[PDB]
Amino acid sequence: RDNIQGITKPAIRRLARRGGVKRISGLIYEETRGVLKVFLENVIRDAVTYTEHAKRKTVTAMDVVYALKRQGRTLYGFGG
Amino acid sequence: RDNIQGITKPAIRRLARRGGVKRISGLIYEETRGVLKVFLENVIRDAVTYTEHAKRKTVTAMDVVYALKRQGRTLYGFG
Amino acid sequence: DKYRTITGMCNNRRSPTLGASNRAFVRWLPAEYEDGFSLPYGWTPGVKRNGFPVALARAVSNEIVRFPTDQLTPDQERSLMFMQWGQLLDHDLDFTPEPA
Amino acid sequence: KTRKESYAIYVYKVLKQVHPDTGISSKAMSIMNSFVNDVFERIAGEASRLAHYNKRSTITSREIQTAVRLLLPGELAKHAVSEGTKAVTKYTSA
Amino acid sequence: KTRKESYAIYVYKVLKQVHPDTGISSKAMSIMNSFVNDVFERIAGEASRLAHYNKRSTITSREIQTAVRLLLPGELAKHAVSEGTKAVTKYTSA
Amino acid sequence: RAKAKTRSSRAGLQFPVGRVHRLLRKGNYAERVGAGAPVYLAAVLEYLTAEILELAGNAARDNKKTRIIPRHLQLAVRNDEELNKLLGRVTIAQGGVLPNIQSVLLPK
């Protein structure tokens, strides 16, 4: 159940390359994993709250979109 | 009217001291004046729009409070 | 410098004569001539432009511009003040004299 | 003249409940009134959004509870929920 | 099957007005639908707040105009205002 | 009864005035909604849509394509100061990023 290691070092390196980073230190990967886990925890907690209020058992895409819009991270393309 | 120079160098030094700054380069006073001018221009433009919508000629404190709140800068103490 | 000069002189400090009247136009692209310096295209018969003959302007107007007048379509969102103000503004901006 | 309602007497009642020997100035009371209005607006707006998402025409205690859980951070939210729930019980019995 | 309303045919009509020979995919249409909904909600919320501030109970074209002035940045706003006025006048003539 | 003509046709628009009026009435914004508010909102929305679609179509044409994809919408939005300010806190799915590299990292 240690799936946080599924975000491999090459994936973090690709994400850094898209951001314009040329050289990456060796301790960046654990910090990035922690940051991603924090972000995902917040968003998923809000989405699950939205799902539970509707008395549903599946987390729909609209719940995720509303959860993101709550944090100020509006997302276009999924839902309406 | 060149009133931006009314925000003097010692006033900027005091504002930096409250912010925890120990040493200050001599080139940040013009930069701080520019930053303050931009911020004030935005807020005052919004406040004057709110005033003009109400067909008034006096800018009230509520107009300033609303103009700040709509920029994500809620201010408590003026209604 | 409280008012404009009639000739528009000394409007720009760097180049006072720039922007005034009775001066050369600005060329946004280098000019092309059939001789390279001052000869207009179509001056000398038989001179091909980029491997193609130079069309007669009257012929182009005859084939392409010409259209029967009886199917004129009026503009549903403009008035003749549009054309008049365009002409007046143009007469403000530029005027290219030619020898009499 | 005219009438200007505010949350001043209720804030003073709560303050007397908490600190019976402590007073409060006018600027601090203005700040507290602004705080109460701001939180009311936030919770009510979130509840309205929740009701609109599920295609409901009514704001109920469920919407208010979900809005409180979404807005208030951390253990704060939990405690608030308890308080609210207790009220809606004591109100229903009486 | 329940009908799902969207701003798809209108966006396609505008696209055919601007680029008569250019098509659009499904993800791009979803993005444009979300954009239209977002801007509608922003402007309508600002207009509602403006109506509430001045103790009015009607959303008029002046509230919409002021909301467009407040929300849209710089030159955009100006052009938008013009377009809006250009419509209402025409709508009044007919 | 005369032949019904849509309100958006009288205003010379493409976006629906009637649907916008219904959304304003049903959306819990104010107790009453004027007759000219839907026309103004429809005109503003149509203007913004036309602007962003024109920019996206130009971006697609510069790429020698025919169909608009989210990449073209992102390129249109991020290359325009006003539109970038309007959509500063908005993520476009499958949009990518604007290509830039800091001058410090380039070889000298």
Place this chain on the structure above:
Amino acid sequence: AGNAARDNKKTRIIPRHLQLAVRNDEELNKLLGRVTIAQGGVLPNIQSVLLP
């Protein structure tokens, strides 16, 4: 706020005490994160590198 006022040997609550109460509490600071309290001042905090 009343605790902050008492620690200051004062009877009345002023905006400084409200600011001290809000900023020194994690949950309340996160709730009022983008809020300015008039006449509240700031929290005493100097970076350790600046100290002699």
Place this chain on the structure above:
Amino acid sequence: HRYRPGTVALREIRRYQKSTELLIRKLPFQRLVREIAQDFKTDLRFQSSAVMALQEASEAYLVALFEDTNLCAIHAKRVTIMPKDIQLARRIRGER
């Protein structure tokens, strides 16, 4: 034959700034999302669109954070990004 250090890095920067695809494998991310959601509710289901939206949001967030981190690193007259740059960017942004 061998390229100098920093050349393939620039080539990769140019390559991944032109594409629009997702740079994280989908199955590990889905497993991570399910594991995280296990701590809030038990026996939860996810639409595929929900996981895709979460992935898009997370990737956009991380790319923007890395841009800010690169700016912070360049400020200190450096070319490599260290965890201190990430911490400074997050603290200035207001996240910590």
Place this chain on the structure above:
Amino acid sequence: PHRYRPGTVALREIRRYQKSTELLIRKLPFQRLVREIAQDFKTDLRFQSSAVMALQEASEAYLVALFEDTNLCAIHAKRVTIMPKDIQLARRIRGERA
């Protein structure tokens, strides 16, 4: 004669101005600046005293927070002095001049 080493009076001022709650800008110059700024948007505008007071409070809070971020940026680059590039970096990361 007596003399303090550089940085002693600076730290004393830091301790003094982080304990007070007053306003650090003179009121009349700020009021004149606000009126001159508002002159562009509309002519013959009147201001309540509370409006100017609110503007001053908001401006001072904004500047103090910006200077805190600027100090962090300066300390990051192993410095004690505060330079305009630190202000620019803080405003870029905050999302203002980005």
Place this chain on the structure above:
Amino acid sequence: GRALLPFDNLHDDPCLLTNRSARIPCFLAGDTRSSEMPELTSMHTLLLREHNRLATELKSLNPRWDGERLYQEARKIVGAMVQIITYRDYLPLVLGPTAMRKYLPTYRSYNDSVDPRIANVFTNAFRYGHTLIQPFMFRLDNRYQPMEPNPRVPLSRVFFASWRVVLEGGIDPILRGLMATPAKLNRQNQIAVDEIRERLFEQVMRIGLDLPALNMQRSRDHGLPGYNAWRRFCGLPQPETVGQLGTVLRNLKLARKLMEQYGTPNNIDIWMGGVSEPLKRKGRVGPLLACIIGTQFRKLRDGDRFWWENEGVFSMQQRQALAQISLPRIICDNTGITTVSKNNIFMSNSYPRDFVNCSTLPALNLASWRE
């Protein structure tokens, strides 16, 4: 009882040649072309009347002022008026919202590093208005009804006919006809009317002229580059074959005709390519003409040190007073017409749906000119 333009003396006056019996020579103004048609002369006379009225009201406002001071002040007022009317009403209706926003963004300040000289291509890229010319001149009475005699006159008989201004009811019917007549829509199969193509200056000249052919010939004379060079200069894709040209023009017959007359898109004249393109949305020019015109007017605005919005040229109250001017106010204030169009005068062309009495719209408040 209203002023007219001063007369001019010339060795060979075409105004007299148009009609010997009437014997009215050409007028005199700041330009030598001010008498080609009665409409241009009417606009010139209106501007002259406005300047005279402004000078009179400034003298009544400030009696100590000298004549030179009054002249200079009214000159500044009229210049700012022309700039405001143009850049606020005319250019948006030409370029359209997108091109106007792209090429003429918000004004910032004067910029001396900008060249305000008129480009060579502009003199050929601003002739798009030759496609908006109606083949008739319309005059209307006080009720906006066809004025007798001759309610509509062929355009071939109004060229240089200055006698039609002095002896045919003045400039009021001409302005009334201009305000309440739709223009001509430029279509890819209807470029320009035959009145200006086969009967231009018919009476004065031995033979009629061809305005489009004159345009292409003058483009050749000035040595301007071809259509593709300007397409590349503005940043638009450059067609090479028949299919690419048809894609660019959104028309196949026109592309075929252009290729059969020129042989390559590199050789098409700038006027032909400019007016053969499909018009922008809510604009009256294609992308290339929009690019050229917007660039030229942006340079003119940003390089002018006496711009009406520049700091120090006008006082703040003077700016607020000037921002409220309008063409209909001037039209119904400087002559006898009472009913004028509303909002954008360049857009209202239907009587009486979009007309007002101009007793409602405010005038120009000169009270800020006290010294």
Place this chain on the structure above:
DNA sequence: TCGAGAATCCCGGTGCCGAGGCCGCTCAATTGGTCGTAGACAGCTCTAGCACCGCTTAAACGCACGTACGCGCTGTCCCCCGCGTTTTAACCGCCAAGGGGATTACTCCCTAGTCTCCAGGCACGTGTCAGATATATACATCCGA
């Protein structure tokens, strides 16, 4: 370490103005029924989320070099700080006008609310042509001799 000198802190008077408590009203909040629809159940369909398997094969993972960059470590110099003197205008208190926010009151247009009727806009079905996918080729660039 130790003493002289600023600087800040901690106590005792002395007013004074703002916070807290008391009346008088009036305008919402409460109490007592009616009514109609929104929401709470149950059934029932059928969509889509979960699970499982087999196979390429592209990705990830170790590992070995080497070089370029992060990081201390001097050294200079110049720029910012601390302090004293002179100059300026902020601040406080008091007067005098008047613009213009707030209340009344009094209609009038304008919007909600109800039927009738259709067309506009959905869902569903179909086909063809952009575009993603191979494949060889031609440049463009980088590292090194």
Place this chain on the structure above:
DNA sequence: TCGGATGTATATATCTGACACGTGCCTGGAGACTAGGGAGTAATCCCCTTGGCGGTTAAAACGCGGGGGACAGCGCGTACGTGCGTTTAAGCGGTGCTAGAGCTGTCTACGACCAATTGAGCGGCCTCGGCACCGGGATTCTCGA
């Protein structure tokens, strides 16, 4: 600093699935008419904003001496980038099942809506004590020996 290896953009066929039309249906928008309350003009009213004047003095300006940080240059060594070979699950199809999302129907109880009554809260009015200045001494920290 001219020639070699590698990477990437380009032009030419194939195929497919997704986008752009076509058609049928139904329900949401348009056309009428009526009723009433929101808001647009007017006419007072007083309040609070602006403008002015004079004196005291606190803070902004300016100048100077010096020291302590900012910035540049110089090793050094280590850690990160680049290849290369091996392992490993990711992605893609296909099959099968069932949970639960979504729609339909019925009915009931809960909230809106009136009318009548009254007391809770707001505005105006006093009044006294908590706090803001005053002075002084006490204690502390700093920096040159």
